[PDB]
From Swiss-Prot, chains A, C:
Entry's free-text remark on domains: The second or the third transmembrane region are responsible for Golgi localization.
Biological process per Gene Ontology, one example term: symbiont-mediated activation of host reticulophagy
Subunit structure of this chain's protein: Homodimer, a subset forms homotetramer of two homodimers linked non covalently. Interacts with M, S and E proteins. Also interacts with the accessory protein 7a. Interacts with host VPS39, sequestering it on late endosomes. Interacts with host HMGB1; the interaction enhances the association between HMGB1 and host BECN1, promoting reticulophagy. Interacts with HMOX1; the interaction promotes ORF3A-induced autophagy but is unlikely to be involved in ORF3A-mediated induction of reticulophagy.
Regions of this protein lying in the Extracellular compartment: 55-62
Name of the protein described by the UniProt record: ORF3a protein
Annotated keywords: Activation of host autophagy by virus, Glycoprotein, Host cell membrane, Host cytoplasm, Host endoplasmic reticulum, Host endosome, Host lysosome, Host membrane, Host-virus interaction, Ion channel, Ion transport, Membrane, Secreted, Transmembrane, Transmembrane helix, Transport, Viral ion channel, Virion
Summary of the function given for this chain in its UniProt record: Plays a role in viral egress via lysosomal trafficking. Forms homotetrameric ion channels (viroporins) localized at endosomes and lysosomes, that may induce deacidification of lysosomes, allowing safe egress of virions via lysosomal trafficking. Also blocks autolysosome formation by binding and sequestering the host component VPS39 for homotypic fusion and protein sorting (HOPS) on late endosomes. This prevents fusion of autophagosomes with lysosomes, disrupting autophagy and facilitating virus egress.
Protein's organism: Severe acute respiratory syndrome coronavirus 2 (2019-nCoV)
GO MF annotation list: identical protein binding; molecular function activator activity; monoatomic ion channel activity
Swiss-Prot record, chains B, D:
Domain of life per record: Eukaryota
Family the UniProt entry places it in: Belongs to the apolipoprotein A1/A4/E family.
Subunit field text: Homodimer. Interacts with NAXE and CLU. Component of a sperm activating protein complex (SPAP), consisting of APOA1, an immunoglobulin heavy chain, an immunoglobulin light chain and albumin. Interacts with NDRG1. Interacts with SCGB3A2. Interacts with NAXE and YJEFN3.
Residues included from the entire protein: 81 to 111 of 267
Compartments in which it is found: Secreted
Sequence repeat placement: 10-31
Task of the protein: Participates in the reverse transport of cholesterol from tissues to the liver for excretion by promoting cholesterol efflux from tissues and by acting as a cofactor for the lecithin cholesterol acyltransferase (LCAT). As part of the SPAP complex, activates spermatozoa motility.
PTM remark: Glycosylated. Palmitoylated.
Methionine sulfoxide PTM positions: M30
Annotated disease: Hypoalphalipoproteinemia, primary, 2: An autosomal recessive disorder of lipoprotein metabolism, biochemically characterized by severe apoA-I deficiency and severely reduced serum high-density lipoprotein cholesterol (HDL-C). Affected individuals have undetectable serum levels of apoA-I, and develop xanthomas and corneal opacities. The disease is generally associated with atherosclerosis and markedly increased cardiovascular risk. Hypoalphalipoproteinemia, primary, 2, intermediate: An autosomal dominant disorder of lipoprotein metabolism, biochemically characterized by partial apoA-I deficiency and reduced serum high-density lipoprotein cholesterol (HDL-C). Affected individuals have half the normal plasma apoA-I and HDL-C levels, and may develop xanthomas and corneal opacities. Most patients do not have increased cardiovascular risk.
Protein name, UniProt field: Apolipoprotein A-I
Length: 193, 31, 193, 31
């Protein structure tokens, strides 16, 4: 027999981890990794309590008025598994772990010999501005920051699960152009074909 | 993997477009 | 007194709503509202299963080796309640519903007579670039878009829960300056006090 | 409400800073 108390223990642990996941600030990279790990543990606990309660129902014999609900859970969890696979493939394509750390719809990426840049971005726009601050020395879009390791490229690429859009560097705004000291603005126009 | 990736895109997009279509009046009703 | 079967029903509904919340794309505004509503229902269901399983333990008499867990949940949920209040207050400060819809750490805001703009933003930077596209006519930062209703202001403000940073318009980049047709770039330098 | 916000700000910041200090070695161990 399957005792009922493991369902309560699983519910209590799931509540602990879900409540903790609700209140982790997403500012530093270690906090992002912590939040992703806690969400992974939450999903594992949710799978446990779902499967275990379904087993309790089956051992009781009252599963039949819940087949549609449990099938719905398993279908949505299969979709989530496919989504996690696509996120890992986005990490492979971006040559970065940032798609795992960030929930953004898009990632602006470019390749240098010593670093692969991958910055979160929300939508496909006709232009993209990369802000570069010197000495930390960093690239920044939308308040998202990557440490400077090398120069800009003439072409950057916005990646999603299914799309890739290329951007060509059109203009470089210096402090004499803008008045903002110690800051450069690289302006990219979307390539249309 | 390449085939299934191209399969998944329009399916997801059309699902969300359809869910926008069938729920337009209700979402107006909240607003 | 309290049947064990409501715990299973609550777990099944919580699993349905959590699994659905994992797979809602956050692109359009109605999807953001749907995702936040589903998350609210998820948290209500989590509170239900936690409190109900605690009541099952108390009615059984086995609550004690779980009290430190349940107290922990309640403590974390209390923090989440406070966080929600702060989010609502941010909505009051930004004169917008965007802090409810978006999980961003900061919101860049400015006031016009016909509209209050509130755009998600990730961190306090020394500069902010607002991109304006004409005819959809919109303002854009980091791929986040607000529909155009009026002109830019000479001063914008980045709001968080506890901080406010002011930015002064330093430069306006036109298509003759950048080469990007039909796009204007408004560059704001952080005001230092 | 303003006093509570002024109390809440640095408390949250110092909690996350302290958690970073106590977890620096362990986070190095994962890396």
């Amino acid at each position: 027999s399957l005792p009922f108390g493991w369902l309560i223990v699983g519910v209590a642990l799931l509540a602990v981890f879900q409540s903790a996941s609700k209140i982790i600030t997403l500012k530093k990279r270690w906090q992002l990794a912590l939040s992703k790990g806690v969400h992974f543990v939450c999903n594992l606990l949710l799978l446990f309590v779902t499967v275990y309660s379904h087993l309790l129902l089956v051992a009781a014999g009252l599963e039949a008025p819940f087949l549609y609900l449990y099938a719905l859970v398993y279908f949505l969890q299969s979709i989530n598994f496919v989504r996690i696979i696509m996120r890992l493939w986005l990490c492979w394509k971006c040559r970065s772990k940032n798609p795992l750390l960030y929930d953004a719809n898009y990632f602006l990426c470019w390749h240098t010999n010593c670093y692969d840049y991958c910055i979160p971005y929300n939508s496909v726009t006709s232009s993209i501005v990369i802000t570069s601050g010197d000495g930390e020395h960093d690239y920044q879009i939308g308040g998202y920051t990557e440490k400077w390791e090398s120069g800009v490229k003439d072409c950057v690429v916005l990646h999603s699960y299914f799309t890739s859009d290329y951007y060509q560097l059109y203009s470089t705004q210096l402090s004499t152009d803008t008045g903002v000291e110690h800051v450069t603005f690289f302006i990219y126009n979307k390539i249309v074909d | 993997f390449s085939k299934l990736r191209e399969q998944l895109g329009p399916v997801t997009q059309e699902f969300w477009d359809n869910l926008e279509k069938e729920t337009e009046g209700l979402r107006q009703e909240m607003s």
